[PDB]
Amino acid sequence: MGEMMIIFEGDDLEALEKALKEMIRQARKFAGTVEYWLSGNRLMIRITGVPEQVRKELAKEAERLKAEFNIQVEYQIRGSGSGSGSEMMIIFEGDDLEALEKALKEMIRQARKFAGTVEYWLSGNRLMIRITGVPEQVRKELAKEAERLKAEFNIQVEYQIRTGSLEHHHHHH
């Protein structure tokens, strides 16, 4: 297990999407889970559930795509958390921006206080906070704080929880 951020940049949209197609084919081949986002001339690809040697191989693939499609490539790695696979995600919603950003400040100081690392995204009236590397007891407290901020600033809250880092997709036919 490990995370990897790969960034493709190029002015040719078609070549960029050809590189995407191949990169995520390689990642999925090594049992990677890919997240990606295309905006303008930039393509960002987040690959999770991949150990060290797999990341080394995917890096090789990224370097090869750089030559084949004439694009710029940069990649970054966690790189190696000692212990990991303990995740929580919180979503705040409200029409008051000022209150939302107060909630953000309190939640991430709290999360960092319990030695958790945060990622957050504010867009419109929706604020998303992702907290990783956080065990069961900590999530219980962070949930309390979420409920505290919920009541205090009169905003909406919802949660999604990952505990095993094993992801199950169900298909019905």
- How many amino acids of this chain bind a copy of itself (CB under 8 A)? 27
Tell the smallest beta-carbon distance from residue 105 to ligand 4NE (Å): 16
The binder of a copy of itself chosen from 154, 156, 160, 163 (CB under 8 A): 160
- 73-77 contacts, C-beta under 8 A, 24 or more apart: 73/6, 73/7, 73/8, 73/9, 74/6, 74/7, 75/4, 75/5, 75/6, 75/7, 76/4, 76/5, 77/2, 77/3, 77/4, 77/5
Q: Is 102 in the site for a copy of itself (CB under 8 A)?
A: no
The binder of a copy of itself chosen from 38, 59, 99, 157 (CB under 8 A): 38
Tell the smallest beta-carbon distance from residue 106 to a copy of itself (Å): 14
How far from 63 is each of 15, 18, 29, 56, 72, CA to CA, in Å?
15, 14, 17, 11, 9
Tell the smallest beta-carbon distance from residue 128 to ligand 4NE (Å): 4
151 or 156, CB closer to a copy of itself?
156
Q: Is 36 in the site for a copy of itself (CB under 8 A)?
A: yes
